[PDB]
Amino acid sequence: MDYRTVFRLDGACAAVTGAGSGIGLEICRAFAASGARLILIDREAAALDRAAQELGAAVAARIVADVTDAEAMTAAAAEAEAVAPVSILVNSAGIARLHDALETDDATWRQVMAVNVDGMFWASRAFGRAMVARGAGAIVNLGSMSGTIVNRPQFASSYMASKGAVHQLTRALAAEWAGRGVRVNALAPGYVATEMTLKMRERPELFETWLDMTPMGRCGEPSEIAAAALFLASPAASYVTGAILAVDGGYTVW
Amino acid sequence: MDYRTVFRLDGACAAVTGAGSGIGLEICRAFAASGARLILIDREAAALDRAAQELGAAVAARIVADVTDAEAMTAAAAEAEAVAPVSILVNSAGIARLHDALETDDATWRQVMAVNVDGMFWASRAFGRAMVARGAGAIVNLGSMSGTIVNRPQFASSYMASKGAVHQLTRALAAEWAGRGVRVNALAPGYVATEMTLKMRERPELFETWLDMTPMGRCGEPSEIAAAALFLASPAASYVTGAILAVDGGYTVW
Amino acid sequence: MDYRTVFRLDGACAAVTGAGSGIGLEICRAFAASGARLILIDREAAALDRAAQELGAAVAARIVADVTDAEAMTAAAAEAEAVAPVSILVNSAGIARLHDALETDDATWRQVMAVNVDGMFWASRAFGRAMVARGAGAIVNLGSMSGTIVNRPQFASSYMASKGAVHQLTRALAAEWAGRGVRVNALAPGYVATEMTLKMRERPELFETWLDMTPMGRCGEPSEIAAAALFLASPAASYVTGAILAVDGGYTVW
Amino acid sequence: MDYRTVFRLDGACAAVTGAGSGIGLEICRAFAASGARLILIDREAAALDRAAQELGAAVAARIVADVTDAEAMTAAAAEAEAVAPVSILVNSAGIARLHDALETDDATWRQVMAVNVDGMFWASRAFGRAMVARGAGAIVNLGSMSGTIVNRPQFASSYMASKGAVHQLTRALAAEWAGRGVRVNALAPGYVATEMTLKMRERPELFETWLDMTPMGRCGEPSEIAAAALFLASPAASYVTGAILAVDGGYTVW
Ligand SMILES: NC(=O)c1ccc[n+]([C@@H]2O[C@H](COP(=O)([O-])OP(=O)(O)OC[C@H]3O[C@@H](n4cnc5c(N)ncnc54)[C@H](O)[C@@H]3O)[C@@H](O)[C@H]2O)c1
Ligand SMILES: NC(=O)c1ccc[n+]([C@@H]2O[C@H](COP(=O)([O-])OP(=O)(O)OC[C@H]3O[C@@H](n4cnc5c(N)ncnc54)[C@H](O)[C@@H]3O)[C@@H](O)[C@H]2O)c1
Ligand SMILES: NC(=O)c1ccc[n+]([C@@H]2O[C@H](COP(=O)([O-])OP(=O)(O)OC[C@H]3O[C@@H](n4cnc5c(N)ncnc54)[C@H](O)[C@@H]3O)[C@@H](O)[C@H]2O)c1
Ligand SMILES: NC(=O)c1ccc[n+]([C@@H]2O[C@H](COP(=O)([O-])OP(=O)(O)OC[C@H]3O[C@@H](n4cnc5c(N)ncnc54)[C@H](O)[C@@H]3O)[C@@H](O)[C@H]2O)c1
Ligand SMILES: OC[C@@H](O)[C@@H](O)CO
Ligand SMILES: OC[C@@H](O)[C@@H](O)CO
Ligand SMILES: OC[C@@H](O)[C@@H](O)CO
Ligand SMILES: OC[C@@H](O)[C@@H](O)CO
Ligand SMILES: [Mg+2]
Ligand SMILES: [Mg+2]
């Protein structure tokens, strides 16, 4: 057993949705640094531009696709497989919409569920197919502490519901594919200091409550989430499947 | 503090989705026996008529409606409020479809999610509005042990994902409405001797595994799930909100 | 089943540890009101007398005993059995001590673990023996939200660990005795307005925080814990075993 | 970050209980291969001699002590602190005794709780002191799937209870010390192929059930547990605290 290289992804090809920004991009950084080749997937093709510049030779392909389009995910997987066997998938496309339950537009509910759950299933089915055939693979899904507990003070019931679905989808596929050598796990991050949540701080009433409810008294940095994703994606996690790993500064402890 | 009557529902009106069959119908029987009036909601006209026939005077209204139709849920709640103030909602409309993940029809995924999760939200938003305005109500959602664990050996990853979402939806609404006096809780049943279920033996490996995986070594009876729903619906559960109550013969203990 | 009577305990005899005060005594009131005879167990002779006086004819026996004295629990079960078959046990004896981890004296940690865990086992083994012989019984343990999450701002790591043990002990005995018809479940109450929490409730630095962390914005009343205990002990809960039921005004939801 | 070294422990000194065999020893190998120096802690050498002949220059001190003796732990930290500041603690001492609940002798119960829970608290209190004073530390507790579910078919209620306590202790200390820069996490391993558990092969009425209940269909190798401990001990887990990480081949998913 070589512990010096057990966390590496040498020789792996990893597809990452949401690759162009935030957590997906930092996960790409981690994976690249660890020897993986990348299939970058995003709907914002210029956020892809940014990523490919940074990741250089580690990029095997850049694919523009909406995860909510099942046909487009099946196509992305066929295109990726033609470049190299995809042995890792990271589902890091996810959105959040603030809404009071009683005032929720039907479209808001459907949009969040479609991206966060359905899109995860479309990508997992598409990319998982060849992993299952090969009897080898690792899937890391971006769940949330929102799949375990309910945020405060803001309301976003569709987010909570979608992340509950993400955690059970993770486990469902872990169970179904364990016998065929594909591991499936989720991260459950707390608040993460992405450009996007850091602006969500023009609102001290929200932000101060978030910090006060986190034992570490801070948001997680994107790299702290990526380092956990790297662990779950690597052979270090060879006996880890169907796990929901909290990376939340202690948020779910209280 | 009259413990002899604290589980009763005299003077309350309960709306029940999926009232026509299985667990929803047994819940109706339990609630009627406990003094409640009933708004029966189901997509099947013939089933509703049978249900109404047996339930007699306890029925305040019967509404043929599809829980996946948001507009129909909103109209059902307006109709019900005209006929009786609804202070209890039971979301027992659910479906289950067997599918191997890699062989899943997109429509199968969508329909399971639509009924199990979106429908529960549409009904909860619709009927919950007036509860929240009055500052009083109780909602009981039919979750599942499938919201907590993954069944074996059969595969139904949409069911698992939908039930993860149901458990978190329950909790999100619990948190949002707690200050306005509306409690929202879920049952997580094990295997229950219903149609949904007894039609699966019908693959003879299934039942023997199920029972071997259940400490009590038997399926639950619908009446056993209904008695638990009655607890959560009643004033006995006045300090219970956002709870997921396992009623599974110990299945999730092992 | 007959729902009008499914929550009743007529014909039953329940042993309750911690019967002299608080939740235990309220559970005794609830069980007596529901038709049960009672075995009162408490280390405080004077408190037990007051309880016995109040509870009247419902009291079959009163046993002055320390749950940490395993030999006394053994004799107490033999004494009770000579008087009536005990078919229900409630383990409500329990203590909380505030201590900072680094400034913890060995004896504080020992005593909390001894009363809360060891004593629950001594009493369960003792009273459980004849239930298992008979093929029928129901046990209800007082766990806590502190078996799931960690209280704030006060520290009491021994209490947290003890309640983590209570929850697993509950489930362990549920699994082991399921085949012999003995259900074993736990309640996980949030803050409750008792003697246990009386002083702390005077300190606003603690109490404001407790209320702000509780979605219902109040402690539960003893009767609201007792009503849930009654449910678990009754035939209504006949398919519930190994469950941990949160009765915490939504505390563990956030 | 950088990701090439984020999993390393160069310049750290780690104290490991149960270091002479099984998981504790494999963790020592993992930590040594990652640049750590080691305080080896176990009850009799060798044990520790053969561990030192193996681990070479990595060993800073070898301390013989009983984790159940609160004074031996306090002393042990003091001795270790004289050789090197200890920035990492791994509580890998643990025992399991088979016993049916109704055939349980008091000393069996007390001993399992004393090694698994009390011993963990004494070690954490003792080694935690200097960490909290230095505002930096990481503690990895060996929990178990047995702290989440109940094993089958064998009975060992003290092991389950003790492991529930380990999970909650881990969390309590995470909450208490979050503000003082000490992270505290637990692993929850499934069955691990230590020499001890490999002897069960051997008893196929046990072993074959164990494998049938594990989605991966095999026990984990000690290195698979150690790689996960290394993750939690390392800067890669800097936003992970109060987490229970399942490493169980999916055991707790079903
Ligand atoms: N506080 C937090 O940031 C937080 C908390 C809990 C969970 N998460 C989860 O972590 C993951 C990463 O989020 P982030 O913070 O990096 O986001 P971000 O705001 O930094 O960027 C969002 C990215 O998702 C992409 N995207 C959105 N919809 C898409 C679609 N349909 N198809 C393809 N790409 C799409 C966008 O183009 C963009 O690049 C998400 O799954 C999120 O749900 C985040
Ligand atoms: N083993 C089990 O049967 C089991 C276990 C755990 C949880 N549950 C859940 O409990 C609930 C009750 O189901 P059941 O077990 O009685 O199954 P069942 O087949 O006996 O009854 C299903 C009922 O839901 C109704 N329904 C379906 N779609 C509807 C729609 N769109 N609008 C209105 N009504 C609709 C059907 O008409 C029928 O009356 C479901 O939510 C189910 O997911 C069932
Ligand atoms: N905030 C709360 O009140 C709260 C919340 C969650 C869980 N709980 C748990 O509920 C249970 C009951 O608490 P309560 O509110 O009634 O507390 P209380 O202090 O009001 O009553 C506790 C009773 O237990 C008895 N007792 C203590 N040690 C004993 C021993 N060694 N042997 C026999 N009897 C003993 C005491 O004499 C007293 O009569 C306990 O297990 C407690 O941990 C309490
Ligand atoms: N199947 C498994 O191996 C399994 C499953 C779940 C959890 N765990 C947990 O993993 C951890 C390590 O297990 P393992 O497989 O290495 O066990 P092991 O028996 O192989 O080694 C355990 C070590 O603990 C030491 N120890 C025992 N009592 C001690 C005491 N009183 N003082 C000091 N040292 C003592 C022993 O000397 C031994 O070296 C334990 O905490 C165990 O509870 C193991
Ligand atoms: O949108 C704020 C909250 O609901 C989470 O999605 C954290 O981003
Ligand atoms: O797919 C699991 C199924 O058997 C149950 O949900 C219905 O009984
Ligand atoms: O610290 C948790 C415990 O003391 C509570 O029951 C409050 O009294
Ligand atoms: O440490 C041994 C552990 O695997 C026990 O659960 C065996 O019963
Ligand atoms: Mg919380
Ligand atoms: Mg299980």
XYZ file of N, CA, C and O in Angstrom, chain B residues 1 3-4 6-8 10 26-27 29-31 33-34 171-172 174-176 178-179 183 185 189-192 214-216 218-228 230-232 235-254, chain C residues 1-4 6-8 26-27 29-34 171-172 174-175 178-179 183 185 189-192 214-216 218-228 230-232 235-254:
512
model
N -55.592 18.082 31.224
C -54.860 17.073 30.393
C -55.571 15.720 30.406
O -55.379 14.895 31.317
N -55.708 12.497 28.916
C -54.963 11.546 28.111
C -55.869 10.547 27.398
O -55.548 10.097 26.292
N -57.017 10.229 28.007
C -57.987 9.311 27.396
C -58.504 9.807 26.047
O -58.901 9.004 25.207
N -56.766 12.509 24.152
C -55.789 13.438 23.544
C -55.413 13.052 22.086
O -54.902 13.886 21.308
N -55.685 11.804 21.729
C -55.423 11.306 20.385
C -56.626 11.467 19.450
O -56.547 11.095 18.286
N -57.732 12.007 19.969
C -58.944 12.220 19.169
C -58.825 13.457 18.279
O -57.977 14.316 18.507
N -61.962 15.092 17.243
C -63.335 15.646 17.213
C -63.335 17.132 16.844
O -62.556 17.899 17.387
N -57.065 3.696 4.840
C -57.032 3.261 6.241
C -56.858 4.475 7.158
O -57.450 4.541 8.236
N -56.068 5.458 6.723
C -55.949 6.689 7.496
C -57.322 7.351 7.641
O -57.692 7.802 8.732
N -60.215 5.897 7.670
C -60.975 5.090 8.633
C -60.606 5.435 10.068
O -61.494 5.629 10.936
N -59.293 5.527 10.305
C -58.760 5.896 11.620
C -59.235 7.263 12.069
O -59.652 7.426 13.219
N -59.159 8.239 11.160
C -59.508 9.619 11.456
C -61.014 9.778 11.702
O -61.419 10.466 12.641
N -63.015 7.395 12.735
C -63.252 6.718 14.024
C -62.844 7.605 15.178
O -63.339 7.446 16.305
N -61.978 8.578 14.880
C -61.464 9.513 15.881
C -62.181 10.875 15.952
O -61.751 11.775 16.686
N -39.468 18.620 6.584
C -38.668 19.381 7.507
C -38.603 20.854 7.133
O -38.686 21.713 8.009
N -38.490 21.144 5.835
C -38.407 22.543 5.362
C -39.700 23.276 5.726
O -39.671 24.406 6.228
N -41.873 22.289 8.077
C -41.868 22.320 9.542
C -41.178 23.580 10.032
O -41.732 24.273 10.875
N -39.991 23.870 9.498
C -39.181 25.009 9.954
C -39.805 26.344 9.571
O -39.835 27.280 10.388
N -40.318 26.418 8.346
C -40.907 27.648 7.824
C -42.195 28.050 8.542
O -42.461 29.250 8.711
N -43.406 26.580 11.647
C -43.427 26.352 13.108
C -43.882 27.580 13.906
O -44.677 27.462 14.827
N -43.356 28.753 13.561
C -43.710 29.992 14.270
C -45.153 30.435 14.059
O -45.671 31.286 14.808
N -47.734 22.268 12.327
C -46.772 21.188 12.464
C -46.753 20.354 11.188
O -47.782 20.110 10.571
N -44.938 16.689 9.809
C -44.156 15.521 10.177
C -44.317 14.434 9.122
O -45.233 14.506 8.305
N -42.658 4.457 6.627
C -43.042 3.051 6.815
C -42.082 2.048 6.212
O -41.403 2.355 5.233
N -42.062 0.846 6.790
C -41.414 -0.290 6.176
C -42.342 -0.852 5.107
O -43.189 -0.140 4.559
N -42.169 -2.139 4.812
C -43.096 -2.845 3.916
C -44.475 -2.940 4.559
O -44.591 -3.365 5.704
N -45.495 -2.514 3.814
C -46.878 -2.573 4.276
C -47.660 -3.435 3.310
O -47.473 -3.330 2.089
N -36.204 -7.619 8.010
C -37.094 -6.978 8.987
C -37.049 -7.679 10.345
O -37.518 -8.826 10.470
N -36.516 -7.001 11.387
C -36.448 -7.632 12.716
C -37.773 -8.290 13.183
O -37.735 -9.407 13.707
N -38.912 -7.630 12.980
C -40.190 -8.204 13.364
C -40.608 -9.376 12.463
O -41.518 -10.151 12.825
N -42.118 -9.534 9.525
C -43.426 -9.452 8.864
C -43.623 -8.085 8.235
O -42.972 -7.096 8.641
N -44.538 -7.992 7.268
C -44.977 -6.683 6.789
C -45.843 -6.012 7.864
O -46.452 -6.680 8.698
N -45.882 -4.694 7.847
C -46.869 -3.979 8.653
C -48.247 -4.044 8.010
O -48.373 -4.256 6.791
N -49.274 -3.877 8.831
C -50.637 -3.745 8.325
C -50.922 -2.270 8.160
O -50.422 -1.460 8.940
N -51.743 -1.898 7.155
C -52.074 -0.473 6.988
C -52.574 0.192 8.269
O -52.261 1.360 8.513
N -53.331 -0.544 9.083
C -53.846 -0.007 10.350
C -52.720 0.429 11.299
O -52.871 1.398 12.082
N -51.574 -0.239 11.183
C -50.424 0.091 12.016
C -49.774 1.399 11.562
O -49.248 2.133 12.382
N -49.825 1.671 10.261
C -49.334 2.953 9.722
C -50.362 4.046 10.059
O -49.999 5.148 10.491
N -51.649 3.730 9.874
C -52.732 4.688 10.185
C -52.754 5.150 11.655
O -53.001 6.331 11.940
N -52.486 4.233 12.582
C -52.464 4.584 14.014
C -51.346 5.588 14.288
O -51.506 6.503 15.070
N -50.213 5.411 13.606
C -49.097 6.342 13.748
C -49.406 7.702 13.130
O -49.060 8.736 13.714
N -52.371 8.910 12.902
C -53.312 9.488 13.878
C -52.609 10.174 15.046
O -52.940 11.314 15.391
N -51.620 9.512 15.634
C -50.739 10.152 16.604
C -50.215 11.506 16.094
O -50.422 12.528 16.736
N -49.513 11.513 14.955
C -48.877 12.766 14.446
C -49.879 13.863 14.079
O -49.567 15.045 14.166
N -53.546 16.272 18.709
C -52.914 17.176 19.660
C -51.898 16.479 20.578
O -51.076 17.153 21.194
N -51.932 15.148 20.664
C -50.895 14.426 21.390
C -49.482 14.744 20.875
O -48.540 14.689 21.640
N -49.355 15.039 19.584
C -48.058 15.326 18.977
C -47.770 16.826 18.931
O -47.029 17.286 18.073
N -48.331 17.593 19.860
C -48.173 19.072 19.822
C -46.742 19.628 19.917
O -46.506 20.775 19.529
N -45.792 18.867 20.469
C -44.383 19.282 20.446
C -43.525 18.520 19.428
O -42.275 18.560 19.482
N -44.198 17.842 18.505
C -43.542 17.100 17.419
C -43.723 17.829 16.095
O -44.841 18.005 15.610
N -42.622 18.321 15.556
C -42.613 18.903 14.221
C -41.267 18.660 13.531
O -40.207 18.694 14.172
N -41.337 18.382 12.228
C -40.149 18.019 11.416
C -39.577 16.645 11.740
O -38.465 16.320 11.337
N -40.341 15.832 12.472
C -39.894 14.475 12.813
C -40.129 13.525 11.660
O -41.121 13.649 10.943
N -39.202 12.581 11.485
C -39.383 11.497 10.572
C -39.551 10.283 11.489
O -38.585 9.858 12.182
N -40.756 9.744 11.526
C -41.068 8.611 12.408
C -41.006 7.253 11.689
O -41.866 6.977 10.839
N -39.999 6.429 12.035
C -39.850 5.092 11.457
C -40.965 4.233 11.984
O -41.201 4.186 13.195
N -41.693 3.603 11.064
C -42.737 2.648 11.445
C -42.464 1.470 10.528
O -43.166 1.273 9.540
N -41.420 0.693 10.841
C -40.852 -0.226 9.859
C -40.449 -1.570 10.414
O -39.660 -2.296 9.780
N -41.007 -1.937 11.570
C -40.733 -3.228 12.171
C -39.260 -3.396 12.504
O -38.767 -4.531 12.636
N -38.538 -2.277 12.590
C -37.104 -2.328 12.916
C -36.199 -2.386 11.682
O -35.011 -2.622 11.812
N -36.762 -2.231 10.485
C -35.978 -2.455 9.245
C -34.706 -1.583 9.207
O -33.593 -2.060 8.921
N -34.873 -0.331 9.569
C -33.752 0.620 9.545
C -32.823 0.520 10.772
O -31.874 1.308 10.887
N -33.071 -0.433 11.670
C -32.170 -0.665 12.813
C -30.938 -1.450 12.381
O -29.840 -1.202 12.862
N -31.139 -2.426 11.516
C -30.047 -3.246 11.018
C -29.339 -2.543 9.883
O -28.185 -2.939 9.551
N -58.235 -2.683 13.244
C -58.207 -2.513 14.732
C -59.306 -1.535 15.183
O -59.922 -0.859 14.343
N -59.568 -1.478 16.493
C -60.446 -0.437 17.041
C -59.620 0.779 17.456
O -58.937 0.753 18.475
N -59.699 1.843 16.664
C -58.893 3.053 16.872
C -59.284 3.837 18.104
O -58.464 4.544 18.676
N -60.547 3.697 18.498
C -61.073 4.323 19.708
C -60.355 3.872 20.975
O -60.333 4.600 21.965
N -57.102 1.912 20.737
C -55.745 1.451 20.410
C -54.623 2.143 21.228
O -53.539 1.572 21.398
N -54.896 3.336 21.751
C -53.915 4.043 22.576
C -54.014 3.713 24.074
O -53.253 4.264 24.869
N -54.934 2.817 24.439
C -55.171 2.456 25.848
C -54.189 1.384 26.366
O -53.618 0.607 25.580
N -44.956 12.589 35.072
C -46.004 12.897 34.132
C -46.389 11.679 33.299
O -47.557 11.459 33.036
N -45.401 10.886 32.908
C -45.661 9.615 32.199
C -46.489 8.671 33.067
O -47.408 8.026 32.595
N -48.657 9.678 35.253
C -50.033 10.226 35.201
C -50.734 9.787 33.921
O -51.913 9.387 33.946
N -49.996 9.854 32.804
C -50.526 9.487 31.503
C -50.891 8.002 31.455
O -51.940 7.646 30.940
N -50.037 7.150 32.004
C -50.275 5.697 31.934
C -51.434 5.276 32.840
O -52.239 4.393 32.484
N -51.501 5.888 34.018
C -52.609 5.633 34.952
C -53.928 6.039 34.315
O -54.888 5.260 34.325
N -53.961 7.229 33.706
C -55.164 7.714 33.016
C -55.600 6.784 31.901
O -56.774 6.717 31.572
N -54.651 6.022 31.362
C -54.884 5.136 30.225
C -55.145 3.696 30.610
O -55.266 2.832 29.740
N -31.959 0.673 20.143
C -31.928 -0.038 18.870
C -31.330 -1.450 19.006
O -31.872 -2.420 18.443
N -30.247 -1.574 19.792
C -29.629 -2.892 20.046
C -30.653 -3.863 20.662
O -30.812 -5.016 20.187
N -33.925 -3.456 20.680
C -34.992 -3.654 19.680
C -34.672 -4.809 18.703
O -35.536 -5.652 18.388
N -33.431 -4.842 18.210
C -33.020 -5.871 17.268
C -33.002 -7.229 17.944
O -33.539 -8.237 17.379
N -36.748 -8.398 19.086
C -37.849 -8.279 18.105
C -38.552 -9.626 17.864
O -39.787 -9.687 17.750
N -37.767 -10.690 17.856
C -38.287 -12.046 17.595
C -39.102 -12.575 18.760
O -39.810 -13.584 18.629
N -41.012 -4.643 21.928
C -40.633 -3.451 21.145
C -39.830 -2.549 22.048
O -40.076 -2.494 23.262
N -38.202 1.385 21.952
C -38.096 2.692 21.278
C -37.632 3.774 22.239
O -37.728 3.619 23.458
N -36.477 14.125 23.338
C -37.120 15.397 23.602
C -36.163 16.560 23.434
O -34.951 16.391 23.574
N -36.710 17.721 23.119
C -35.928 18.973 23.144
C -35.974 19.471 24.586
O -36.205 18.680 25.504
N -35.765 20.773 24.811
C -35.900 21.302 26.160
C -37.313 21.110 26.713
O -38.317 21.313 26.012
N -37.390 20.687 27.972
C -38.676 20.426 28.622
C -38.724 21.191 29.937
O -37.721 21.251 30.658
N -34.949 26.864 18.752
C -36.130 25.989 18.693
C -37.164 26.642 17.777
O -37.591 27.754 18.050
N -37.519 25.989 16.654
C -38.455 26.606 15.709
C -39.811 26.955 16.336
O -40.386 27.997 15.994
N -40.310 26.130 17.265
C -41.552 26.461 17.981
C -41.388 27.624 18.995
O -42.393 28.197 19.479
N -40.374 27.709 22.111
C -40.751 27.401 23.506
C -40.207 26.026 23.909
O -39.916 25.222 23.041
N -40.057 25.772 25.215
C -39.811 24.411 25.708
C -41.078 23.616 25.565
O -42.167 24.182 25.468
N -40.948 22.293 25.538
C -42.128 21.461 25.592
C -42.614 21.320 27.033
O -41.828 21.468 27.977
N -43.896 21.042 27.202
C -44.431 20.703 28.531
C -44.229 19.201 28.787
O -44.286 18.405 27.853
N -44.015 18.797 30.063
C -43.953 17.374 30.401
C -45.033 16.518 29.760
O -44.709 15.447 29.289
N -46.278 16.986 29.738
C -47.417 16.241 29.147
C -47.246 15.947 27.643
O -47.762 14.955 27.129
N -46.514 16.815 26.950
C -46.267 16.618 25.511
C -45.224 15.521 25.276
O -45.228 14.879 24.231
N -44.310 15.339 26.232
C -43.367 14.198 26.193
C -44.120 12.937 26.601
O -44.001 11.879 25.956
N -44.912 13.053 27.679
C -45.690 11.905 28.144
C -46.674 11.383 27.129
O -46.866 10.173 27.045
N -47.308 12.266 26.354
C -48.264 11.779 25.352
C -47.549 10.948 24.266
O -48.074 9.936 23.769
N -46.343 11.363 23.927
C -45.549 10.611 22.927
C -45.090 9.266 23.504
O -45.044 8.255 22.790
N -46.670 7.604 25.787
C -47.888 6.795 25.768
C -48.107 6.126 24.412
O -48.385 4.925 24.343
N -47.973 6.900 23.338
C -48.092 6.348 21.970
C -47.147 5.158 21.802
O -47.564 4.064 21.411
N -45.870 5.376 22.115
C -44.857 4.321 21.934
C -45.120 3.068 22.778
O -44.768 1.955 22.368
N -50.414 -0.289 22.002
C -50.595 -1.079 20.777
C -50.710 -0.256 19.492
O -50.521 -0.810 18.400
N -50.990 1.049 19.593
C -50.930 1.913 18.410
C -49.573 1.840 17.707
O -49.516 1.988 16.472
N -48.497 1.658 18.493
C -47.109 1.641 17.978
C -46.627 0.208 17.688
O -45.433 -0.068 17.742
N -47.556 -0.689 17.342
C -47.238 -2.132 17.253
C -46.242 -2.479 16.131
O -45.621 -3.537 16.170
N -46.064 -1.576 15.163
C -45.045 -1.827 14.124
C -43.844 -0.888 14.267
O -43.014 -0.769 13.332
N -43.756 -0.235 15.428
C -42.634 0.683 15.714
C -41.668 -0.004 16.658
O -42.015 -0.321 17.801
N -40.454 -0.249 16.191
C -39.420 -0.682 17.103
C -38.055 -0.232 16.623
O -37.796 -0.168 15.412
N -37.207 0.086 17.587
C -35.908 0.690 17.292
C -36.002 2.119 16.781
O -34.996 2.666 16.295
N -37.163 2.766 16.892
C -37.243 4.163 16.438
C -36.749 5.168 17.467
O -36.876 4.979 18.685
N -36.196 6.261 16.964
C -35.867 7.382 17.812
C -36.821 8.481 17.374
O -36.712 8.985 16.241
N -37.779 8.829 18.234
C -38.800 9.823 17.861
C -38.439 11.168 18.446
O -38.443 11.305 19.679
N -38.150 12.152 17.579
C -37.856 13.523 18.034
C -39.138 14.189 18.512
O -40.135 14.197 17.787
N -39.094 14.752 19.726
C -40.193 15.521 20.297
C -39.530 16.785 20.815
O -39.369 16.972 22.012
N -39.131 17.651 19.880
C -38.214 18.757 20.194
C -38.597 20.124 19.628
O -37.744 21.029 19.536
N -39.880 20.309 19.307
C -40.373 21.588 18.731
C -39.624 22.006 17.452
O -39.587 23.212 17.095
N -38.995 21.029 16.795
C -38.238 21.232 15.557
C -36.761 21.520 15.768
O -36.064 21.803 14.800
N -36.281 21.484 17.017
C -34.853 21.746 17.292
C -33.849 21.065 16.343
O -32.940 21.719 15.827
N -34.020 19.772 16.090
C -33.054 19.051 15.236
C -33.298 19.251 13.735
O -32.626 18.613 12.912
N -34.296 20.063 13.380
C -34.577 20.372 11.970
C -33.573 21.382 11.407
O -33.143 21.264 10.260
N -33.297 22.424 12.182
C -32.269 23.405 11.808
C -30.843 22.907 12.019
O -29.857 23.449 11.426
